[model samples]
Target: KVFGRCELAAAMKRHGLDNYRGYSLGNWVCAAKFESNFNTQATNRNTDGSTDYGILQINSRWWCNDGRTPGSRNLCNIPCSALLSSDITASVNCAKKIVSDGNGMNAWVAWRNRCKGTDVQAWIRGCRL
Candidate 1:
C-alpha cells in the first residue's frame, strides 16, 4: 500500500517519535521497519482466519475486545481500523506498551541477538526493564 508522508508525520507526532538516530531510533525503528515498514495500513493473514494489521501489524482479528468484532474495535485493545481515519495513536501506544510491557523486547533481543547473539535468557537479559 501507499503511505503519505503527512500521515506518517502525524502518526510519528502522535507517538512522540521525532528522532531517528542512534540506538533509540535504531531499536524502535528496527522493530517498526521489520514489523510493517512503518506502514500503518500493513496487514497479514493467519491460517486461523486471524491477521496482523496496521502499523504495528496488530493482530486485531485475535486480540481486539472492544465488542467491534475481530477486525473491529475489539482487537488488541486497539483496533486497526482506527488508523483508517488517519493515525492511530492508541494503537501505537498499545504496541509500545506490548513491546515494553513484558519480555516482548527481549523476544526481539533474542531474535536480533545484537547484544551477544547468544541464547539470551529473558530472566537475566531484557529491555532494561
Candidate 2:
C-alpha cells in the first residue's frame, strides 16, 4: 500500500520514530521518501543480488529473511514479507533495532546519498506536522 506523505509522517510520529534512538523525524521522513516514497510494498533488487524490502527498504543481506535471499543474518528476526504490509509496526520495530545498532539513518544508502546534508524538513513540507 502506498501512503500519502502526511499520512506516513503521522504514523512515524505515532510510532515515536520522530526521535527514535536520537534521530529526528525529518531524517526518517527524508529517508523514507527517498527510499520507497511511502510505498509499504516496495521492493528493490540490489546490484549485489540482495533485495531491499518495505518502506525503509530494509536489506535482505543482514536484516530479514525472504527465504529466497541466502545468507541473511536475520538480525531483525522477522520475515521480509511482514515488512511489506500496510501496518508498519513490525517494520518500525525492526528499524528501531537497526538504528539502535549505531548506524542511525546511515543504514540506508538513500539516507546517506540524498537525505544527508539536505534540508530534511522539506521532506514533510505542508504536512503540518
Candidate 3:
C-alpha cells in the first residue's frame, strides 16, 4: 500500500543528507512520524485559522519558500487534511526535510516524551523497521 518512492527520493535529495546531523536516515524517519503521525496529506487548523500541511506540516504559508518545479509545494497535492492521501514516502520525507536543520531525532524524542510521554526510539527499535 505504500507509495511515493520517487517523491521520497526527491525529498531526501532536497534535504541534502550529506549535511545532516548524526544518524541521518533513522533520525529523519523518527522525526517524520513525530511531525505528521506519518501522513503526507495531513494538515492542522490552528484556533487562529492558520494551517499546517503535509507530513511535515509545512504550514502552507511557510511552504512558500520551497523552490518550485518537480518538488514544488503544489506538485503532489494530497488534500489539505488527510495527511496520508496516497503519498506516504513524500509525506514522511517532507517532515525529514523540515527537521534537516538539525535536532536529529532528538526533536522527535522530546516531542514523544513531552506529548505522547513515550519512549519513541525504544519503541521503534522494538519493531526494527
lDDT of each structure?
0.48, 0.88, 0.45
Instruction: List clashing residue pairs in candidate 1.
Output: 63-75, 63-76, 64-74, 64-75, 64-76, 65-74, 65-75, 66-74
- Stronger candidate by lDDT (2 vs 3): 2
The order by descending TM-score is: 2, 1, 3
For residues 1-129, write the lDDT of model 1, one tens digit per residue.
444434444455447543322223234444445566667666666565666666555655544432333444442454456643345665556655555545554533322554323332321222222
| CA lDDT for candidate 2 | 0.88
Q: Which portions of model 3 show Cα errors greater than 4 Å? A: 1-20, 23-35, 39-41, 64-84, 102-119
The TM-score obtained by model 1 is: 0.53
- Cα lDDT for residue 76, model 3? 37
Give me candidate 3's TM-score against the actual structure. 0.43
**Candidate of highest lDDT:** 2
How big is the positional error of residue 94 in model 3, measured in Å on the Cα after superposition? Answer: 3.3
TM-score of each: 0.53, 0.93, 0.43
User: In candidate 2, which residue ranges exceed 4 Å CA deviation?
Assistant: none
Q: Please write out the lDDT profile of model 3 over residues 1-129, one tens digit for every residue.
A: 232433343454455532354443434444445556555655565454446655555544333223322233542344334444554444444444545646544434434444343443442343322
Model 2 CA lDDT for position 62: 87
